[PDB]
Design a binder for this molecule. Structure first.
Ligand SMILES: Nc1ncnc2c1ncn2[C@@H]1O[C@H](COP(=O)(O)OP(=O)(O)OP(O)(O)=S)[C@@H](O)[C@H]1O
Ligand SMILES: Nc1ncnc2c1ncn2[C@@H]1O[C@H](COP(=O)(O)OP(=O)(O)OP(O)(O)=S)[C@@H](O)[C@H]1O
Ligand SMILES: Nc1ncnc2c1ncn2[C@@H]1O[C@H](COP(=O)(O)OP(=O)(O)OP(O)(O)=S)[C@@H](O)[C@H]1O
Lengths: 245, 422, 121, 425
């Protein structure tokens, strides 16, 4: 029957979170944090702050998930108010990261309405003079495994970006994702000092009951797609309720 | 909504694979790990799944035919662009140089440039890029698996087309290094013996019932015209026989068996007659002389000469006799198992001149045959291949096992059981 | 074990060896050896995490029982025979005492006189 | 320049500005100074002598970041701007390659794009040929001088020339930099004329704070109670209680005494109070205010406390088991280095030392097979690979690389003591 296929579609696209952004259901045990992030990000876009921050927590901690949740949520609200730039630490070496910035910047400008031209040195100085310098566009960054930049050798790119945080009139924002709990000691004196010293640890599930409630959130559907949705959710809560099931 | 095929021993895996993969790019996860050791038919169950579901779109790569990640990237680029050119002939396109990409980020930029133009698509469609054996890349490092995991994120989220990978790997000692990513994965355990036989027979009857040699010997012997089943019976019987007789030697492989079968089928055919076709028993009792030895080998009385024999047999003497004792047990008045210790030149010459049967002092043929040996890699040097023939720090060690030593001793009639004492 | 358990039973003037009279024999033989598994050198510089988990799972199970046992009151001994005897060897049951003491602090149950043990409303 | 307009858009619906927002806005890290007063004048007169008399010298300055030295030299060369010179911020940590400085130089001299070779050729040419003073900011010199000092060798052998139209204002991190990597011959040309920058006293910190709060200290805004907007509908006032400022200055001057750290922690407490005030009234983002000591107390404590303890108190029971076993091994062998398979053996111990208790039975079952006796008899515990990794990448645990996973070593990066304490909670 069509209904069962439709309901399976709904449940599956939920269990990837691929629902439309307004329908995503974020777990309670971390709401505040994204709330904490929400301000941190929205007042960095609307009120044009320029503060940096580092999310930290183990893998599979929804870091990029919370980030893209916020960005999508803002997209429908403030479409052109900003641009987004993500430079994964893994694939982007310290030198390739420059070209990454350049290219993502140019193809964001071509979406909001010559940069990659030149050599690595030239494109780097170009992005410098471009950023460092009615409203002004804010440019939000996202780093995955930012720690890989923070090798003992250079720690250059982080330094330059935190300098942008410190100086540039364009209100920038940085969301470093990583996993090294003692991320700070990696950052050198110059880098640490540049850094706003604000790092938010991501929470973990502290109570069995919290995980039960998280499963409840995930599995539950909130509208009628197939006639069984009521039957579905009632069977759901039945099986999830009894501590002997 | 997809047609899950059926495989003789992949029921759970077929179901879970069709569950982790569908048309909808939304409910389709980013990556996937078909894991399991070589001999479980991953490259076959996956193919026999795709051929059941042709509406979707995939690309097939052979990471073993490539060598490094550079050709890997370049091949990914060229295959993707050609696959799209051949998937939608109508859309105009500007092909980007697949030989231009040399960095993992160059790949992402190129793919973005390739996908932004396909935005005239009618619906979000998936594209499953299959890497067949991402483990066996000859230059693997810790920092490659994640390098390929993360490409989902860099690429735009709302592109009309969605690249989704399917990695294939073995040696769970590798997949363990990436558990915390919690990427969905399926495992293929190796088969038991019986199911091995089942797969093997149902896959090789088509080869053996209609091969050239058996059909030939049909008319080459009394005709005894018969139905197809008689050949089925005899072939399947030979199959069960060879597998049940060589299992303990081959393990649960499917390829090794697919080699033994072809190495031992022609002779077995030769040993059939007019009568045994209805009698597998006597057929076995007649062809026995092969069922009991691999004969997979295709102690030599080495060409080397007397002076070489003595050179080698003396250079073997300090695989147990350190220079602490030689000047005692050889004067002019167990490490048989372990890897040999290192000689030094002019000790070899010493023991040689000792146990050569004052008779000889010339050393031109001696060193001549020494270089001969070193070209035969019987007494190799731990040091380099060019400066050995100086006298810098350089050690020599035998690379012949003890049986050839017994042989050389008996043939030269010199005895060696003496110098080893414990 | 045998020559020593029969001596223990000789003590207390017991005429026949019981079952709960070889147990202290085992204890005594284990006086020397209690603390090493593959390598010697006992060491053992004497609340553990695995003890935490033991108390926790006991709490889980006993709450589930007492909420499934509608007659909310039962003795500690009755409760032991209800759970600690269903299967393999009995437990200290003073760790059960700590469990129920926690359930008094947390107030998930109420001893309510030594004779029984009730839960909370 | 060209792309600057490309960052300016129009859709802006009267962004709401609350009180603490304005505060942090002037409290920004960008906009005479009290802390460095005699240093200001000293470097001012150094450059005055070097330029107004048309000579060339080397002004070395060193000290930890955040002492204002970048701002201080900028103030000096800014007052000098009003009275020949090219302020060329050659930051080694901004140079993509080490040699790239040359090109900037090689550009700022003529505006040409060639290699570093011809760059320095024409540079020295200009330094010894041109008939007759350009302040090149050698920011964070360390990066440039790492390979074999050839870079700084050049950068100062240029300076040593007499008629060289070349003043350098070098800033390094540490004082002994010229005496630990630079060549002795180089060290001499560097000279003994280096100005040191001390830390900052909490007095100076108060000064800089009230400076940033000059026009805003204890001042009045005109705040509409409906929207939370602030204008420098009730005329509210705000006081920034200088006692919290005092305690923050004291704490920072204690360990570091850095302007950046102090500014930022002040901003942090400010925005904390801001979010509390916003929550208490819910203005969203479209009588009298103060900042209690408790705000700065929280904001400052958060800059010291770690999380490793509060983290390990939240790991999976498997992880805690692993760690506790590792600690038993550390004290049993006194080696603070264990073998991985040995740890597995110890976990087996710890599971079996307790009796056949039904609860130990459940533990054994699950930890070795998630129930479902159908599949059972695991060699090493479930998720063991997974939890090992979840630890390792988290920087807690630290392991060498041998594909043989029974003799590979393992070591705690954190202190044993704090780990034990974490086990005790
Ligand atoms: N495109 C996506 N849409 C929705 N959820 C996603 C997406 N990609 C990943 N996730 C979720 O992200 C969660 C894991 O967090 P991620 O941020 O993706 O990875 P992480 O380990 O938490 O941090 P990273 O990504 O490794 S730096 C999982 O629950 C995934 O379901
Ligand atoms: N269930 C099956 N049904 C039919 N044939 C099978 C089955 N399983 C394995 N085979 C055969 O065994 C072969 C082994 O396939 P492969 O996937 O190459 O083996 P493998 O484990 O992948 O090792 P590789 O090739 O190095 S990845 C297949 O090509 C089939 O011919
Ligand atoms: N006297 C002051 N008045 C106002 N703000 C100050 C003062 N001193 C320092 N600051 C602030 O603190 C920052 C410290 O920057 P600087 O110390 O000049 O840079 P730095 O010492 O060179 O650090 P680097 O660049 O990593 S070596 C300044 O940019 C101001 O934001």
């Amino acid at each position: 029957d069509p209904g069962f296929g439709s309901l399976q579609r709904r449940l599956l696209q939920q269990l990837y979170g691929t629902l439309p952004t307004d329908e995503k259901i974020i777990f309670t045990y971390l709401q505040d944090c994204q709330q904490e992030i929400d301000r941190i990000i929205k007042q960095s876009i609307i009120q044009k702050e320029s503060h940096s921050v580092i999310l930290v927590g183990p893998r599979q901690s929804y870091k990029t998930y919370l980030l893209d949740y916020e960005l999508s949520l803002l997209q429908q609200s403030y479409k052109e108010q900003f641009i987004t730039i993500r430079l994964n630490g893994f694939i982007h070496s310290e030198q390739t990261a420059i070209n990454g910035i350049a290219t993502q910047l140019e193809q964001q400008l071509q979406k909001i309405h010559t940069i990659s031209s030149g050599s690595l040195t030239e494109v780097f100085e170009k992005i410098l003079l471009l950023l460092d310098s009615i409203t002004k566009i804010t440019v939000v960054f996202i780093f995955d495994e930012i720690d890989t930049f923070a090798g003992p050798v250079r720690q250059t790119l982080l330094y330059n970006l935190f300098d942008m945080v410190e100086h540039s009139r364009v209100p920038v924002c940085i969301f470093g994702c990583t996993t090294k709990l003692n991320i700070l000691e990696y950052l050198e004196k110059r880098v640490k000092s540049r850094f706003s010293q604000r790092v938010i640890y991501m929470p973990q599930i502290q109570n069995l009951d919290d995980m039960v409630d998280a499963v409840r959130n995930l599995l539950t559907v909130r509208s009628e797609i197939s006639p069984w949705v009521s039957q579905w959710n009632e069977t759901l809560e039945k099986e999830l309720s009894d501590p002997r099931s | 909504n997809v047609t899950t095929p059926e495989v003789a021993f992949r029921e759970y895996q077929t179901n879970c694979l069709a569950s982790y993969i569908s048309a909808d790019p939304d409910i389709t996860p980013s990556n996937l790990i078909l894991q399991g050791y070589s001999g479980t038919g991953k490259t076959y169950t996956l193919k026999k799944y795709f051929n059941a579901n042709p509406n979707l779109h995939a690309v097939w790569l052979e990471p073993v035919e490539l060598v490094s990640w550079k050709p890997l990237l370049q091949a990914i680029a060229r295959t993707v662009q050609y696959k799209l050119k051949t998937l939608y002939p109508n859309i105009p396109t500007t092909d980007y140089d697949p030989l231009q990409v040399e960095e993992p980020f160059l790949l992402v930029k190129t793919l973005h440039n390739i996908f932004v133009q396909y935005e005239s698509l009618q619906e979000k469609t998936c594209l499953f890029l299959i890497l067949d054996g991402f483990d066996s890349l000859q230059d693997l490092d810790a920092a490659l698996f994640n390098k390929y995991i993360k490409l989902n994120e860099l690429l735009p989220k709302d592109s009309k087309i969605n690249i989704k990978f399917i990695y294939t790997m073995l040696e769970t000692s590798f997949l363990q290094r990436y558990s915390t990513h919690c990427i969905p994965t399926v495992m293929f355990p190796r088969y038991n013996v019986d199911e091995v036989s089942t797969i093997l027979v149902m896959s090789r009857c088509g080869e053996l019932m209609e091969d050239s040699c058996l059909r030939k010997r049909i008319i080459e012997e009394q005709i005894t015209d018969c139905t197809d089943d008689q050949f089925q019976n005899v072939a399947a019987n030979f199959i069960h026989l060879i597998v049940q007789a060589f299992h303990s030697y081959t393990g649960n492989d499917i390829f090794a068996l697919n080699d033994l079968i072809d190495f031992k089928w022609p002779k077995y055919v030769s040993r059939i007659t007019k009568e045994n076709i209805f009698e597998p028993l006597a057929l076995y009792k007649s062809a026995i002389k092969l069922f009991l030895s691999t004969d997979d080998n295709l102690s030599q009385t080495y060409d080397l000469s007397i002076i070489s024999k003595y050179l080698l047999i003396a250079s073997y003497i300090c695989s147990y006799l350190e220079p602490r004792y030689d000047a005692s047990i050889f004067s002019r008045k167990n490490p048989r198992y372990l890897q040999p210790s290192l000689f030094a030149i002019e000790r070899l010459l010493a023991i040689f001149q000792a146990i050569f049967p004052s008779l000889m002092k010339a050393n031109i043929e001696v060193f001549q045959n020494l270089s001969e040996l070193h070209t035969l890699k019987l007494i190799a040097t731990t040091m380099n291949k060019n400066i050995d023939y100086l006298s810098p720090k350089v050690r020599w060690k035998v690379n012949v096992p003890w049986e050839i030593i017994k042989e050389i001793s008996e043939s030269v009639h010199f005895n060696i059981s003496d110098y080893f004492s414990d | 074990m045998i020559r020593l358990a029969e001596a223990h039973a000789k003590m207390k003037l017991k005429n026949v060896v019981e079952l709960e009279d070889v147990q202290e024999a085992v204890r005594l033989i284990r006086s020397a050896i209690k603390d090493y598994a593959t390598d010697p050198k006992t060491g053992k510089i004497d609340k553990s995490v695995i003890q935490r988990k033991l108390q926790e799972d006991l709490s889980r199970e006993i709450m589930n029982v007492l909420k499934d046992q509608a007659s909310d009151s039962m003795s500690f001994n009755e409760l032991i025979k209800q759970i600690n005897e269903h299967s393999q060897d009995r437990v200290e049951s003073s760790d059960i005492q700590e469990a129920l003491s926690r359930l008094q602090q947390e107030d998930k149950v109420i001893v309510l006189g030594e004779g029984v043990r009730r839960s909370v409303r | 320049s060209r792309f600057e307009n490309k960052l300016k858009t129009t859709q802006k619906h009267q962004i709401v500005e609350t009180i603490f927002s304005k505060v942090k806005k002037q409290l920004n890290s960008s906009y005479y100074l009290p802390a460095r007063e005699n240093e200001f004048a000293s470097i001012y007169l150094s450059a005055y002598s070097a330029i107004e008399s048309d000579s060339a010298t080397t002004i070395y300055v060193a000290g930890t970041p955040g002492v204002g030295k970048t701002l201080t030299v900028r103030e000096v060369v800014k007052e000098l701007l009003s009275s020949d010179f090219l302020y060329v911020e050659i930051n080694g940590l901004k140079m993509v390659k080490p040699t790239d400085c040359y090109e900037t130089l090689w550009n700022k001299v003529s505006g040409e794009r060639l290699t570093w070779a011809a760059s320095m050729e024409s540079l020295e040419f200009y330094f010894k040929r041109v008939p007759k003073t350009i302040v090149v900011l050698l920011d964070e010199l360390d990066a440039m001088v790492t390979k074999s000092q050839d870079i700084m060798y050049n950068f100062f052998n240029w300076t040593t020339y007499e008629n060289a139209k070349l003043i350098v204002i070098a800033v390094a991190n540490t004082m002994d930099l010229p005496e630990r990597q630079l060549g002795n011959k180089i060290t001499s040309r560097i000279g003994f004329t280096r100005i040191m920058f001390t830390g900052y006293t909490h007095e100076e910190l108060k000064n800089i704070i009230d400076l940033r709060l000059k026009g805003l200290n204890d001042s009045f805004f005109y705040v509409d109670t409906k929207t939370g907007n602030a204008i420098l509908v009730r005329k509210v006032r705000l006081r920034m209680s200088a006692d919290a400022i005092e305690i923050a200055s004291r704490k920072v001057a204690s360990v570091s005494g850095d302007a950046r750290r102090a500014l930022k922690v002040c901003k942090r407490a400010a925005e904390i109070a801001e979010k509390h005030y916003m929550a208490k009234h819910g203005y969203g983002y479209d009588g009298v205010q103060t900042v209690h000591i408790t705000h700065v107390m929280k904001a400052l404590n958060e800059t010291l406390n770690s999380h490793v303890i509060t983290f390990m108190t939240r790991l999976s029971f498997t992880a805690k088991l692993f760690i506790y076993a590792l600690l038993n091994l550390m004290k049993k062998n006194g080696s603070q280095e264990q073998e991985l398979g040995d740890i597995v053996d110890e976990i087996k111990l710890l599971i079996e030392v307790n009796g056949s208790n039904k609860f130990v039975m459940e533990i054994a079952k699950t930890l070795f097979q998630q129930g479902s006796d159908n599949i059972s008899e695991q060699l090493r515990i479930i998720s063991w690979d997974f939890v090992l990794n979840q630890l390792l990448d988290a920087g807690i645990l630290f392991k060498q690389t041998m594909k043989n996973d029974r003799i590979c070593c393992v070591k705690l990066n954190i202190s044993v003591e704090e780990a034990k304490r974490a086990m005790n909670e």
